[PDB]
């Protein structure tokens, strides 16, 4: 499997900013056309995945209604970094966040999974 | 490979003459397409008139009578990338005297770059009735004999001084 | 009781054998590279045996006393750790699994202890390193100084690339750079030389250059070779220089720097290669060899019906006629071998049949003989003889295929060996080989063990990476030819590094595995691996080794020839005559005036030499004149010149061979050999050794012939392939499998060609050529790719179909190159030893005057104390003086210089302005402190200070440093010369040289080099003349050849400056194959026979295959012979200095 470093559980206070930090590592040098990164959210383990941010040539923020405008990219992918930031976290943000990285020429696709829990 | 050599400046009347214009590409490996123009202004006159154009494989020569019918091409043949452009004249005449300017146009094909360049070579030729040996050639020949005579003279003088001394030694003992 | 049983178990014949057998078996397992799951249990078994062996050793020895007996020995510590990691591996373990396996590799090491005497052998090798320590500091210091000079002179130079002049969209060079990272993208913008990995290197000066029109030169981007080859940083410069010292692919570095820097910098390389590489490597050999002798010799010194059947027997044993029959057989066998030698890629059926018949008669003759010997001596008597045991196998093998594999036949070639008993040298080659597996078998075995550990270690560490990265070292994303994925492949890389080929592979290991790991492993293999190889070579070599008016006129002419002005005058003519030769080149046409004087000038020279020769006849007479070797040389040269002059002068003549005779004019510099005392002396040494050299060449040919014949059978006619002409890429073989298929493609396709290698095994002569390239290691790899790839005679080659053929090349290298070279070196140095003995034990490389000077230098060695000096009367003098003589003062100054040296290292390309200012200021303080120290010594010392030689060097350095400083400053205010500025700053490196005074160990080594300078100079002069004659032959002969590989603008034979640059590269024998490649091709479509060559009369650029081969081969051999001399001169002086 691809070497992707994320916290399995991330506990954040309601109202604070939550950086979702993941590390992707693969040989070679990243290519802009070549490097693609996808982030998805799920309300629960079995719940449908909702893509909320992509990298395809550049960052594409899908502006999902469930996040308002609180999602930001927070990583320099050339550094193997693809972290995201969720500002002013709300209780409904609790759930599973998935990072998928496919990097040419690497055939393999990395996957990081973070369980975000919102304190009180 | 290609070398640039300047053309001869003295031509004997009533005899064939070859004018040399050679232009060499900076890099031999690169491949480009060339064409040439030669323009000549008669001596004692101003401006220039184009006499011939050579593009593709055929040579086009200006219709004027001064150069009409007595010119041949000595340039590279079949290359399509000439490198060497030379003009050969048969039956040289007084009318063929003055300044000759030859311009070269080259299309260089690179990976995604196409380059058009111009280089100009100027040759001035004056006709003469009788060919004359160059100053370096004549002087060198005269200079060579003097050197030979001195060495021969030096050796003989050397032997003469040596011989008298050797002979004298024999007498004493 | 238990202790007795365990102790009983511990010392047993079987137990040592049992521990060892298991260990050997484990090694086979390491080689798996993806062992099946079932093998895991086997892994468990190996672990258990190790623990069991350890327990008995620990249980019995310790006596529950802390294992005092057990851990006291150093070897067991290694043993203790291996069992534990397995327990630990089972126990919670570290994250790196690939890393985890390497630790187990040590189990293989355990083998050193189990085998008898391996423990003794390894300790001896380690003892060797202690001696090597001093040379190591010097190598580091020497490599370091050159690195500093290289960095200051060439930093940022490798960066130059042609950059396009016109850009769309208003883009700037800076704007373009961040935007593009794609390889295709880099290409549109920069020139890129037709399929090469990186952009063409360009140059600012007229000498270097050049970029095609429409492209301009600017420096940006990574250095060539993945950024690995650069002079930007001290660490990078150090790697570049280390590569130059060991001469690995040095030819490429030299070509790259020269192109960017400009040809004038060729001087840097000559000094570095000449002093840094030839000299430093020699020092290592002398120390290792010198060290080996003391230990080898020191250890050695301490020791000291039935009767009727028998009737037939009388006849045969009477018929053997040992005087005629045995002798007759060897002559017969040599004849058979010659029969074998006749083979070609294409042979008519009739010729092939004769081979079948010729072989049978030979098969018949030997067979009749084999039965005959046993009957005469009976089976027990007959079989006992060693040669006979050897022969029967030969007869047996021949009979087996009498009427029945291709591989089986290839062995018939071996028979040729029986010739060894009669020949003295054959005896030497066999004797050397015996030692490798005989007395020195233990030492040779260590080499095998070390190669095995490295191959496996490399495989474990980088095996996974090569497979995943691939794309980081290829386009088809497939594995490269040299890789570390499998054991055989991992083994091949280690083998290649043993030969000096590490850098090409290392760049690649780094792309996939990272810099830190790849560098550490390769550096260790090279240092540790080479030391063992060096020991084996040296160990093997040393062990193996041990009126009458006419009379007055005749008297007078004699007077003229003897006179100094005349001898002096003649020498001037020779130098002048030789010089005129340089001026003729492809550019002679321009500059018509020089051409005319030179043509006339030669005539005066011809007359002078002819005149001089006549004086020689009168003075010496014919008998004295022709009994002299030199005169014959002189007479032949005047004659060739004379014939051309009369033929040119006579007129009419100027057709064919007359023109060919003219090229012999290049031979003129040769007269010069007699005139210089230094040059002549080197020749005396060579003539003395030609007879000795001659016996060896024959042995090598015989040895090589077997390999060449063997090679011909295996690969003859199999190197052909169908290639796409545009990019020279072989077709897949999925389509176009055979030659017949390939032709059909051509009929319907324009650029597909079916073509041979040009250097191959088609015939025995060519095989001889192919083998030479493989032996030298230059151009060899192109051939091997061909050998392994090959399938059949008319079939397209599959990729790595043979695979194991590499074994053929590996065996040849060990026997062909390692052993013969061992023999070649052994005889030549020994012959030199005999020569020295004959001439009253005097060095043979110095002219009499040089000898007087050499003695004076010897005097400098003495340590008799110089006067102390008197503490002045004045207290200031006393106080100032008292501090200087203090021990601390020298150490403080010494430490200060080291501090200064570290400052130079910090400089790097692209350093910010702030860093530059601090470095400038920091240096000024040193400039001030150092100047300060000099003034202080002067105040106290006075006249006494000038007495010491070192003080003067120190004083001079300060003047240069300050002066260099003002000049650099002066240049900035009024001039803007970047190139000039760098050279000026070079003055400081002078202070670093002061470090030498402090280290006594290095000082002795450096001093020794000084002693050999007179001898080295003579050889250098002789070498220069030979290079000069060759350059001239080359200019006329090879200008106009098509430019292919190794021949391009620059590094071509077009002009004298250019020819000299090439010849120098080839002196080391590097890239010799590359130059020869363009010369070999003749006829379409390899080249065009008639070419215009604008600006000149000559037609065609076709190399002469016959003339070209003789020229390159002769040069390689001649240069090698002289270089053997450098190795001999350095060793002699080194022994003397160390000995004192
Ligand atoms: C031999 O190799 C050449 C060089 O790539 C091949 O030429 C390419 O062919 C394709 C399709 O025919 C073109 O689209 C490319 O532009 C060609 N390359 C160039 C730069 O010319 C060629 O196909 C190969 N020969 C054969 C017969 O397959
Ligand atoms: C050489 O290769 C060719 C190509 O396969 C072989 O000839 C035939 O190839 C055609 C395709 O055009 C097939 O239809 C045939 O089956 C092939 N031959 C046979 C008998 O099957 C050829 O046999 C190979 N060997 C030679 C010609 O020596
Ligand atoms: N240290 C080396 N010296 C040789 O001159 C080099 C040439 O020959 C060789 O076989 O391949 C290339 C290079 O790898 C070489 N490496 C190999 O020997 C080469 O440039 C062209 O073949
Ligand atoms: C979105 O994520 C999916 C994973 O299911 C991936 O296959 C796809 O390539 C991603 N989209 C983009 C545009 O990369
Ligand atoms: C020069 O022109 C003549 C025409 O008379 C031609 O025959 C000849 O080939 C030309 N020279 C060269 C070098 O082509
Ligand atoms: C040269 O030109 C003249 C005309 O002025 C002509 O008559 C003559 O035939 C020409 N020379 C030759 C050799 O044909
Ligand atoms: C020669 O030149 C003169 C003047 O330049 C001109 O009048 C004459 O017509 C020319 N000769 C020919 C044959 O045209
Ligand atoms: C460059 O090529 C063009 C073709 O489009 C041509 O018209 C032009 O004359 C060329 N330039 C020169 C200087 O000849
Ligand atoms: C080129 O110049 C135009 C001005 O018309 C400008 O708008 C454009 O940005 C420039 N191109 C680039 C790549 O900056
Ligand atoms: C090419 O095909 C033609 C068929 O028209 C054949 O006659 C010719 O011999 C072929 N060429 C070769 C070189 O075999």
PDB file of C-alpha atoms and ligand atoms in Angstrom, chain B residues 42 65-66 93 95, ligand 7:
ATOM      1  CA  UNK B  42      30.998  46.906 -61.907  1.00  0.00           C
ATOM      2  CA  UNK B  65      24.506  40.636 -70.934  1.00  0.00           C
ATOM      3  CA  UNK B  66      27.549  41.479 -68.857  1.00  0.00           C
ATOM      4  CA  UNK B  93      36.376  39.468 -69.476  1.00  0.00           C
ATOM      5  CA  UNK B  95      33.479  43.620 -67.964  1.00  0.00           C
TER       6      UNK B  95
HETATM    7  C1  LIG D   7      31.331  45.169 -72.118  1.00  0.00           C
HETATM    8  O1  LIG D   7      31.159  46.343 -71.297  1.00  0.00           O
HETATM    9  C2  LIG D   7      30.884  47.545 -72.035  1.00  0.00           C
HETATM   10  C3  LIG D   7      30.827  48.677 -71.033  1.00  0.00           C
HETATM   11  O2  LIG D   7      30.883  48.197 -69.695  1.00  0.00           O
HETATM   12  C4  LIG D   7      29.590  47.379 -72.832  1.00  0.00           C
HETATM   13  O3  LIG D   7      29.373  48.543 -73.617  1.00  0.00           O
HETATM   14  C5  LIG D   7      29.676  46.150 -73.731  1.00  0.00           C
HETATM   15  O4  LIG D   7      28.420  45.941 -74.364  1.00  0.00           O
HETATM   16  C6  LIG D   7      30.053  44.910 -72.919  1.00  0.00           C
HETATM   17  N1  LIG D   7      30.205  43.752 -73.781  1.00  0.00           N
HETATM   18  C7  LIG D   7      29.186  42.958 -74.124  1.00  0.00           C
HETATM   19  C8  LIG D   7      29.519  41.802 -75.012  1.00  0.00           C
HETATM   20  O5  LIG D   7      28.042  43.172 -73.741  1.00  0.00           O
END
